[PDB]
Amino acid sequence: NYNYLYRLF
Amino acid sequence: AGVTQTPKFQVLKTGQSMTLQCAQDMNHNSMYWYRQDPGMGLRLIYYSASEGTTDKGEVPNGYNVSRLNKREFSLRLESAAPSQTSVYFCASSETGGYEQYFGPGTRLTVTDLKNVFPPEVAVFEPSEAEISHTQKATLVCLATGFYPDHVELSWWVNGKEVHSGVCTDPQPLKEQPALNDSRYALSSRLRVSATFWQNPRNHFRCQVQFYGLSENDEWTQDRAKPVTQIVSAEAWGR
Amino acid sequence: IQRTPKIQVYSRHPAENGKSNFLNCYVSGFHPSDIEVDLLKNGERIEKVEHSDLSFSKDWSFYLLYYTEFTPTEKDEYACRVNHVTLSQPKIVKWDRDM
Amino acid sequence: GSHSMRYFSTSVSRPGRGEPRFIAVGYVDDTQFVRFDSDAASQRMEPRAPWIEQEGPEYWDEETGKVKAHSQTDRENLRIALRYYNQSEAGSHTLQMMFGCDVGSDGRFLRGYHQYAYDGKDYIALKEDLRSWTAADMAAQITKRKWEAAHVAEQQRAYLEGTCVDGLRRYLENGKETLQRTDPPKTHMTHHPISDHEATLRCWALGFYPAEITLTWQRDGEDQTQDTELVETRPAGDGTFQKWAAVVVPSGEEQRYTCHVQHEGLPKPLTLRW
Amino acid sequence: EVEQDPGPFNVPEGATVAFNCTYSNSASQSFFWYRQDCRKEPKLLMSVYSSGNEDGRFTAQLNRASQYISLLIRDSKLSDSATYLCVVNAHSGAGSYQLTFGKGTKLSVIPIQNPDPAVYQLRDSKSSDKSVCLFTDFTNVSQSKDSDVYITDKCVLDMRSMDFKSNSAVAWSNKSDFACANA
């Protein structure tokens, strides 16, 4: 299952 | 560094067009339009992931949006109906999953204009019984008989606003809890020490700014048009 | 930071003339990702060549596999031609049955 | 007997040619099983192995939304990285990411991974604790201080110990006829003279499934890893890998050399000779 | 979806009050408590971290396994009276991450004050018949079941100037025969 990336640098 | 939103109140005749406005200075990419109805939480209308892009929310029908800049995001009702009578909030967030800082919010009552009424303000002088036992006098204001519950009451003592010793009702009362097109009422109190009340050159006035019909609306009635009136009532020190 | 691709050209099975097989060209270790890889038959590029989806190793250096179905013959020559920003002109590596 | 699930993603800015291209691929150990390509027409997460093909509409819808959300997140991160280094819009730039988990052979979760790279250099990486960040740059330290306050490391730790291991075990059983099989290398040797008194003996290994393998050349001394030529492991394209090693020998001294081959599919290491 | 305590919570000043919230979507990624004073905007209160997040009087914890959220308020003040929203960050079926806002729980702190329950008859500066009754410090009530009497929802003052957390309510009726003792 794919990760849940939404946070910005 | 916040989110601003206009107007703060609005009446709309059925079929009238309207465009709420919003802006954020926090350099966020995401902006959102919610509606808050009694008995339900926030409901997304439309959002905008970033500049040039807008997408739908849980309740998009009857509305449209426009992401002008990174700063601005407006929401238009191109045909107003009673179903759209609600409290609309704008909000902004850095991107999708971040916490959303909110705007002050706009009050919409999409009803027939005939229902619009201004408050009937009346200030009531403090009782003698409270004076001799508590050494504090308390004046009460009464803004009765206004349907479009868009009022910003204020107390003025000797030509200057007082933000101390004051307590307006947090929420306007429904004169009929049952009825939907019922008139509303509001109350407020001002505590000075009892010596300030009996001093005769002190001048108290309660000021209920009413937000009603704009001047351009067609008042077909025998009554005067309920424009954005400021009814106020007052008393002097006895 | 740029890395010149390593290049290998080979068959999926050991070559046997007249048997169906696959010609591979495996580029790896390069950076940045954009790269041009052509498979040649008698010095002429093959039109219908396929490639793996872009991916990279632990070093962040990229690798990519290009491949084509083909039937080798003893005299016929196949080759890979890879051009990258690290290369001045495309590098041609001939296919050898023993490498 | 440890296993790994890994997703590698590459975002590449193309100034003047629209939004950056975004590629993402998913692996179980050394077997790719899924992909996403922003330039592809589908705009969907796509199967790349036979055993993932029967996941229902919910899976392909949800995995497509997570990978598309990552592509938009890494578009902004390219714009943010351009600001941190005060670089011009001219020129393409790359932002890679690697994440996944290493569950054991039913010993369950062992390690997680969450890494970033900008233009081929390390940028930021979750430590093995899954609770602390490793910023490689002064600018990556800006992201580290921001990610520390937001406790995003707890989010990744919740993913690496949860959804990552839940999906990796589920893929391991649906692909158990493929993922859990081991293919021993197939071995053979060649002998080509290169000069009158010398010879290039080549030790071959073909058809082994896991990429990990050790090819070692030995003379009478049992190791000569200084004159030995060794190529990178390569994919055959049918799910197996290949590798070979070469050594230069005197003519008539080929028997002094011996090739050792070690791989998981071999019950014991092989000894190859002429 | 997000569900939390039906409420209302009516607690006296200085009380410890706990909020409960549950979120159905197990994939939810970020969690927050938001507060919204009556007839105003929501504002963020704190982020629930499941390691424990406490900010003075306010503490919040997250149970990933139970998928429940809790807010703890020690030493209740009248300044704490508000609607407390449970906010959850979950990926939608598409490629966007949205916040679902719960209906919230209304908190209504009422002061512990003087033993002078009372009603005063107020005279209008103009009228000869209009009258307004008052109260000092309650026993929460809106028990005027009459068809003509009106009752405000008892604003809760926190006056530090005169040092009196006044707890007054207003009442009136159109009838000339309106006794303040009979409302």
Author numbering:
A (entry chain E): 1 to 9
B (entry chain H): 1 to 238
C (entry chain B): 1 to 99
D (entry chain A): 1 to 274
E (entry chain G): 2 to 139, 143 to 187
Sentences reproduced from the published study:
The HLA-A24-restricted NYN epitope (Spike448-456, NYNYLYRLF) elicits strong and broad CTL responses in antiviral immunity. Four natural mutations, N450K, L452Q, L452R, and Y453F, arose within the NYN epitope and have been transmitted in certain viral lineages. Our findings indicate that these mutations have minimal impact on the epitope's presentation by cell surface HLA, yet they diminish the affinities of their respective peptide-HLA complexes (pHLAs) for NYN peptide-specific TCRs, particularly L452R and Y453F.
We crystallized and determined the structure of TCRNYN-I-NYN-HLA-A24 (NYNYLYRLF) ternary complex at a resolution of 3.2 Å. TCRNYN-I docks symmetrically over NYN-HLA-A24 in a canonical diagonal orientation, with the TCRα chain over the N terminus of the peptide and the TCRβ chain at the C-terminus. TCRNYN-I engaged HLA-A24 with an overall buried surface area (BSA) of 518 Å2, with the TCRα and TCRβ chains contributing 83% and 17% to the BSA on HLA-A24, respectively. Hence, Vα dominates the interactions of TCRNYN-I with MHC (62 of 67 contacts; 93%), with CDR3α contributing more to the binding interface than any other CDR. The contacts between TCRNYN-I and the NYN peptide are mediated by germline-encoded CDR1α and somatically-generated CDR3, with CDR1α, CDR3α, and CDR3β accounting for 32%, 27%, and 41%, respectively. Analysis of the contacts between the peptide and CDR loops during binding showed that P4-Tyr, P6-Tyr, and P7-Arg accounted for 39%, 27%, and 21% of the interactions, respectively, confirming the importance of these residues for TCR recognition. P4-Tyr and P7-Arg mainly interact with CDR1α (A28α, Q30α, S31α) and CDR3β (Y98β) loops, anchoring the N-terminal and C-terminal of the peptide at the binding interface, respectively. The principal focus is on P6-Tyr, which alone contributes 18 of 66 contacts and two of five hydrogen bonds with TCR.
